[PDB]
Design an enzyme around this catalytic site. Structure first.
Site, mmCIF file in Angstrom:
data_model
loop_
_atom_site.group_PDB
_atom_site.id
_atom_site.type_symbol
_atom_site.label_atom_id
_atom_site.label_comp_id
_atom_site.label_asym_id
_atom_site.label_seq_id
_atom_site.Cartn_x
_atom_site.Cartn_y
_atom_site.Cartn_z
ATOM 1 N N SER A 171 0.446 -0.149 12.138
ATOM 2 C CA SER A 171 0.994 -1.359 11.577
ATOM 3 C C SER A 171 2.402 -1.611 12.158
ATOM 4 C CB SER A 171 1.002 -1.358 10.040
ATOM 5 O OG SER A 171 1.634 -0.198 9.538
ATOM 6 N N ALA A 172 2.698 -2.888 12.267
ATOM 7 C CA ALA A 172 3.935 -3.431 12.848
ATOM 8 C C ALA A 172 4.112 -3.207 14.363
ATOM 9 C CB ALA A 172 5.133 -2.922 12.058
ATOM 10 N N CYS A 173 3.015 -2.895 15.055
ATOM 11 C CA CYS A 173 3.040 -2.679 16.497
ATOM 12 C C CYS A 173 2.195 -3.687 17.272
ATOM 13 C CB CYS A 173 2.627 -1.256 16.837
ATOM 14 S SG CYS A 173 3.679 0.015 16.134
ATOM 15 N N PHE A 200 4.488 -10.188 24.068
ATOM 16 C CA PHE A 200 3.810 -11.327 23.458
ATOM 17 C C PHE A 200 2.763 -11.823 24.433
ATOM 18 C CE2 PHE A 200 7.869 -10.910 21.215
ATOM 19 C CZ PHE A 200 7.384 -10.670 19.941
ATOM 20 N N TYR A 259 -1.696 -4.609 -5.394
ATOM 21 C CA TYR A 259 -1.285 -5.078 -4.077
ATOM 22 C C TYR A 259 -2.153 -4.528 -2.958
ATOM 23 C CZ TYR A 259 2.036 -6.834 -0.586
ATOM 24 O OH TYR A 259 2.655 -7.570 0.434
ATOM 25 N N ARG A 303 0.888 -1.157 0.000
ATOM 26 C CA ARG A 303 0.000 0.000 0.000
ATOM 27 C C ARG A 303 0.920 1.199 0.000
ATOM 28 N NH1 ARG A 303 -1.009 2.532 4.389
ATOM 29 N NH2 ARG A 303 -0.809 0.687 5.703
ATOM 30 N N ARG A 334 2.680 -11.276 3.035
ATOM 31 C CA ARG A 334 1.364 -11.446 3.629
ATOM 32 C C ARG A 334 0.826 -12.851 3.596
ATOM 33 N NH1 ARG A 334 -0.689 -6.607 6.054
ATOM 34 N NH2 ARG A 334 0.942 -5.129 5.406
ATOM 35 N N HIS A 380 -9.204 1.998 13.118
ATOM 36 C CA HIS A 380 -8.056 1.099 12.849
ATOM 37 C C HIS A 380 -7.733 0.263 14.070
ATOM 38 C CE1 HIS A 380 -3.678 0.484 11.401
ATOM 39 N NE2 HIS A 380 -4.452 -0.483 10.988
ATOM 40 N N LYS A 406 -1.136 -5.477 16.551
ATOM 41 C CA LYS A 406 -2.579 -5.721 16.637
ATOM 42 C C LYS A 406 -2.974 -7.164 16.410
ATOM 43 C CE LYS A 406 -4.060 -2.703 13.600
ATOM 44 N NZ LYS A 406 -2.539 -2.500 13.409
ATOM 45 N N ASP A 461 -7.932 -5.833 12.711
ATOM 46 C CA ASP A 461 -7.517 -4.611 11.973
ATOM 47 C C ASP A 461 -8.509 -3.462 11.965
ATOM 48 O OD1 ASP A 461 -5.354 -3.366 10.369
ATOM 49 O OD2 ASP A 461 -6.777 -3.458 8.698
ATOM 50 N N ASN A 482 1.812 -10.068 27.674
ATOM 51 C CA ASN A 482 0.941 -8.900 27.622
ATOM 52 C C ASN A 482 -0.413 -9.182 28.267
ATOM 53 O OD1 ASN A 482 2.828 -7.263 26.436
ATOM 54 N ND2 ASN A 482 2.148 -7.698 24.345
ATOM 55 N N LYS A 511 -8.887 -0.777 3.348
ATOM 56 C CA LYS A 511 -8.553 0.569 3.829
ATOM 57 C C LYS A 511 -9.408 1.655 3.182
ATOM 58 C CE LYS A 511 -5.228 -0.929 6.492
ATOM 59 N NZ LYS A 511 -5.506 -1.141 7.962
HETATM 60 N N1 GDP Z 1 9.111 -6.985 21.376
HETATM 61 C C1 GDP Z 1 7.829 -7.177 21.038
HETATM 62 N N2 GDP Z 1 7.532 -7.287 19.709
HETATM 63 C C2 GDP Z 1 6.243 -7.492 19.340
HETATM 64 C C3 GDP Z 1 5.202 -7.581 20.371
HETATM 65 N N3 GDP Z 1 4.049 -7.776 19.716
HETATM 66 C C4 GDP Z 1 4.316 -7.807 18.394
HETATM 67 N N4 GDP Z 1 5.631 -7.632 18.173
HETATM 68 C C5 GDP Z 1 6.318 -7.611 16.865
HETATM 69 O O1 GDP Z 1 5.825 -6.559 16.060
HETATM 70 C C6 GDP Z 1 5.872 -6.980 14.694
HETATM 71 C C7 GDP Z 1 4.497 -6.742 14.099
HETATM 72 O O2 GDP Z 1 3.483 -7.581 14.627
HETATM 73 P P1 GDP Z 1 2.053 -7.520 13.884
HETATM 74 O O3 GDP Z 1 1.072 -8.360 14.681
HETATM 75 O O4 GDP Z 1 2.286 -7.811 12.424
HETATM 76 O O5 GDP Z 1 1.608 -5.974 13.957
HETATM 77 P P2 GDP Z 1 0.462 -5.238 13.078
HETATM 78 O O6 GDP Z 1 1.057 -4.970 11.713
HETATM 79 O O7 GDP Z 1 0.218 -4.018 13.926
HETATM 80 O O8 GDP Z 1 -0.739 -6.165 12.953
HETATM 81 C C8 GDP Z 1 6.296 -8.442 14.660
HETATM 82 O O9 GDP Z 1 7.687 -8.545 14.281
HETATM 83 C C9 GDP Z 1 6.046 -8.889 16.076
HETATM 84 O O10 GDP Z 1 6.869 -9.982 16.487
HETATM 85 C C10 GDP Z 1 5.624 -7.450 21.779
HETATM 86 O O11 GDP Z 1 4.795 -7.533 22.707
HETATM 87 N N5 GDP Z 1 6.918 -7.248 22.033
HETATM 88 MN MN MN Z 2 -2.062 -7.007 11.305
HETATM 89 MN MN MN Z 3 -3.923 -2.034 9.395
#
Ligand code: GDP
Ligand code: MN
Ligand code: MN
Ligand code: NA
Length: 610
Positions: free
Chosen positions: A281-283, A518, A230, A82, A400, A259, A285, A306, A521, A239
């Site tokens: 994203s990458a945090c 992980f 994509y 995206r 993905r 979101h 969810k 999401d 949490n 989105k």
């Molecule tokens: N250190 C750490 N990394 C995390 C945690 N939760 C997720 N991650 C990492 O963050 C990245 C993104 O996770 P993802 O579920 O794809 O996030 P989304 O894109 O927000 O859905 C991955 O590399 C996970 O391993 C956590 O509690 N601690």
């Molecule tokens: Mn996701």
């Molecule tokens: Mn998203």
């Protein structure tokens, strides 16, 4: 002569079956894009299997022989994500789409005039589907016939989009019957490569990166997307509709499109509640949404990973539905360790994009944590033999899985309930290596909206603002969105959820994470749960309520450095509030609601008295 009748080109279904306005949308765009055929999708298993085998025979996808009905697409490396820079919204006035930034460049959306868009459109769409099939995808965002559901029609020249939309939405004949003469969002998509091909086709993946443009026209209820195959550029429900067009609709209609994951959390005593969480994203969810709790007796069940559509009902409960029908998750990082529930989901009936393939027909990616047998080799996402000696990943970082939600082992029994699930807590969070504690709770609804507004997260090193995790997705002026959130307090009945903010990513002086994260949490979720119940488990701080000493269960967790993990530093927070002040002034300014400015003033004052 024979009118503007494309009946002779219909290879599945009938134009006469379509509701009147749907027919008009199909025929008008057939006239413009000049497809060779028109396929009205029925959403059947037969349609889906044959389309997959067809793509298989053309070299567009590969079948993954290790699994039950799983498939692999490898893209042109120019079309891997995206692309926000080519993403625009059209309105008469710029200010209706984004606030006018004092600095002159807005981080909060990209506007394009109607005039400029018409020129862009005319440069792209005429004849763009020559030699191709135009598929007509009738889809529901939300459970079929949910009062909170909304219907779209996507026209596309990509079978990959058709297959992926079958997973990610509800699609087919049942939607057309549900729609009848009602309103629908018009979604137009082309890969932008009419036949005969003017440019070489790379990796059997049609795209046009130079003309790529993802446009939204909220006043016409249109999404028009050109040149990318994509993800969020082509799967228009996700989105483009379920956040950008739907946030606008929500504002007009009095609900919320966000979101946010929706997960269910059950204690050891059987007691249940639903929570929504907005992370960028990458945090984490998806991980949180399908979390496998470590704390004994606790259960998590997934509603969505999401997007959340939320509306207060006549009792005042905040009802949420997942408008999606699947997960479109980032594959790298997914292991049995980090996310076992995802791994069980994606073992069948799943489409993988830009991941590696093992010699025995399986999938591979960074962080999969699944040792391979000696002799098993790996083909990267770029169709090359790969080993860990190389300086490149086997899978693209944005690669993905696209998988049905119903296959999730812990899918919530109410995940399709037409009324939605009652939300009792809203969680904000992202990646903050310094300063921000594991968890805190907002002092009021107004404070909570400010907490959303103030969100910042490490870029995936730079820390950027990402309010409400909606920076890429606001369908209209963010200040106005703030006002819309604040307005929820002014309706009698509304039972306003408790708002929390989390941080998994706080790091020590040596750059090691201070919190394991992980499944651990779940100990944070535990602390949150009790508070909604009214437990006296909170200590007041300048930023909000934090856990009292010993309130968090750290049992089975050895010695976590809790002093550093919950530290609140005057010096850090005085810098924080100043940065936030300058951001809101620049980026929101005249559209910043009085209540958010008041909350900033209040926070600054509380910090000043530390
Ligand atoms: N250190 C750490 N990394 C995390 C945690 N939760 C997720 N991650 C990492 O963050 C990245 C993104 O996770 P993802 O579920 O794809 O996030 P989304 O894109 O927000 O859905 C991955 O590399 C996970 O391993 C956590 O509690 N601690
Ligand atoms: Mn996701
Ligand atoms: Mn998203
Ligand atoms: Na390919």
């Amino acid at each position: 002569h024979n009118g503007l009748d494309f009946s002779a080109k219909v290879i599945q279904g009938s134009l006469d079956s379509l509701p009147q306005e749907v027919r008009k949308f199909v025929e008008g765009n057939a006239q413009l894009c000049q497809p060779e055929y028109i396929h009205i999708c029925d959403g059947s298993e037969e349609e889906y299997g044959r389309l997959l085998a067809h793509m298989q025979e053309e070299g567009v996808i590969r079948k993954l022989k290790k699994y039950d009905n799983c498939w692999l697409a490898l893209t042109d490396p120019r079309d891997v994500a995206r692309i926000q820079s080519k993403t625009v919204i059209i309105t008469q006035e710029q200010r209706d789409t984004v606030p006018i930034p004092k600095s002159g460049q807005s981080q909060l959306g990209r506007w394009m005039s109607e005039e400029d868009f018409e020129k862009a459109f005319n440069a792209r769409f005429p004849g763009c589907m020559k030699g191709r099939t135009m598929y007509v995808i009738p889809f529901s965002m939300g459970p079929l016939g949910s009062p909170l559901a909304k219907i779209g029609i996507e026209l596309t020249d990509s079978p990959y989009v058709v297959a992926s939309m079958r997973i990610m939405t509800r699609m087919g004949t049942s939607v057309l019957e549900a729609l009848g003469d009602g309103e629908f969002i018009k979604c137009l998509h082309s890969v932008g490569c009419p036949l005969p091909l003017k440019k070489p086709l790379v990796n059997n993946w049609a795209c046009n990166p130079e003309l790529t443009l993802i446009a939204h026209l909220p006043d016409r209820r249109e999404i028009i997307s050109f040149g990318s195959g994509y993800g969020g550029n082509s799967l228009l429900g996700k989105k483009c509709f379920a956040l950008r067009i739907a946030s606008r609709l929500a504002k007009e209609e009095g609900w919320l499109a966000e979101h946010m994951l929706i997960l269910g959390i059950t204690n050891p005593e059987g007691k249940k509640k639903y929570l929504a969480a907005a992370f960028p994203s990458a945090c984490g969810k998806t991980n949180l949404a399908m979390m496998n709790p470590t704390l004994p007796g606790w259960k998590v069940e997934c509603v969505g990973d999401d997007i959340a559509w939320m509306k207060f009902d006549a009792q005042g409960n905040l009802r949420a539905i997942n408008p999606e029908n699947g997960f479109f998750g980032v594959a790298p990082g997914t292991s049995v360790k980090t996310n076992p529930n995802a791994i069980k989901t994606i073992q069948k009936n799943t489409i993988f994009t830009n991941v590696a393939e093992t010699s025995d027909g399986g999938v591979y990616w960074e962080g999969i944590d699944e040792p391979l047998a000696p002799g098993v080799t790996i083909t990267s996402w770029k169709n090359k033999e790969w080993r860990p000696q190389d300086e490149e990943p086997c899978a693209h970082p944005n690669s993905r899985f696209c998988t049905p939600a119903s296959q999730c082992p812990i899918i919530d029994p109410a995940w399709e309930s037409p009324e939605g699930v009652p939300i009792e807590g809203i969680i904000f969070g992202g990646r903050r290596p310094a300063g921000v504690p594991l968890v805190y709770e907002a002092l009021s609804w107004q404070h909570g909206v400010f907490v959303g507004a103030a969100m910042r997260s490490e870029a995936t090193k730079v820390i950027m603002h990402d309010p409400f995790a909606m920076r890429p997705f606001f369908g209209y002026n963010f200040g106005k969105y703030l006002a819309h959130w604040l307005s929820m307090a002014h309706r009698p009945a509304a039972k306003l959820p408790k708002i929390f903010h989390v941080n998994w990513f706080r790091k020590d002086k040596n750059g090691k994470f201070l919190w394991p994260g992980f499944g651990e949490n779940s100990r944070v979720l535990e602390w949150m749960f009790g508070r909604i119940e009214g437990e006296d488990s909170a200590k007041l701080t300048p930023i909000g309520y934090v856990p009292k000493e010993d309130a968090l269960n750290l049992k089975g967790l050895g010695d976590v450095n809790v002093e550093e993990l919950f530290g609140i530093s005057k010096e850090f927070w005085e810098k924080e509030v100043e940065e936030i002040d300058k951001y809101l002034e620049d980026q929101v300014n005249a559209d910043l609601p009085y209540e958010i400015e008041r909350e900033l003033r209040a926070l600054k004052q509380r910090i000043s008295q530390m």
